[PDB]
């Protein structure tokens with residue numbers, strides 16, 4: 001091939017590779033439309049991983065390479081926790097990237113810590129989009145689990161709220177291991193949704209009137225250490241009704257980010 005390899009990890013396998021005739025180190029994703037994927041090469045943002053080349057012959061996607069992901073960093077930080085100023089910077093940057101692609105009517109659809117790449121300079125970038133269309137369901141929005149066949153940009157805000165909570169508490173918010181276990185983990189924390197808080201929920205394809213009715217707990221129980229600014233913002237990212245869920249652009253204006261900075265992480269590569 002044109003590259004030397006090293007595997008680093010739903011669409012296919014991903015390799016760290018070196019371009020044999022530029023020296024460039026890249027992320028090589030082998031899959032197993034073309035006109036629209038290629039439009040993504042032209043769209044770039046500091047908080048989105050760059051798509052360098054599309055190659056069809058099997059579908060190959062060449063991305064810029066980043067050394068660490070947020071899942072590895074959270075595990076590495078599990079005894080101490082990520083410092084709040086760094087959580088806030090990462091959240092702010094992720095909302096910046098979401099606001100950009102949502103402004104282009106592009107959804108991620110499968111945000112998770114594993115898909116969030118970080119570098120030594122303090123940046124974090126969206127990667128591994130779910131665009132081609134054991135699976136982790138922990139960050140799935142409730143409208144997806146209830147079988148809605150039209151995602152909106154709100155599904156990415158939901159996932160990012162789940163990731164926000166996980167950075168703060170150092171435990172996954174909703175670690176379900178089946179669709180209904182995921183759904184009921186959400187229900188037990190936020191209350192079983194009804195027509196009052198989510199108009200139209202009872203007519204969604206996978207809704208059952210027989211769902212158990214759990215009462216809502218309180219956000220002070222959910223992300224304890226977090227101050228009222230952060231708890232407020234998280235509550236707005238976890239609204240059941242996708243129409244009530246805060247947008248990325250509005251989240252950026254939230255008081256939580258009034259003192260945001262850009263700290264440098266301690267990374268062990």
Ligand SMILES: O=C(O)c1cc(C(F)(F)F)ccc1Nc1ccc2[nH]c3ccccc3c2c1
Pocket residue numbers: 011029031037040041043044048049050051061100101104106127128129130131132133
């Ligand atoms: O992440 C992946 O695996 C991935 C897979 C495909 C596949 F459909 F070919 F599979 C396509 C794109 C993919 N990511 C990607 C890369 C750069 C980007 N730039 C953007 C600007 C605005 C909105 C979105 C993006 C964007 C998204």
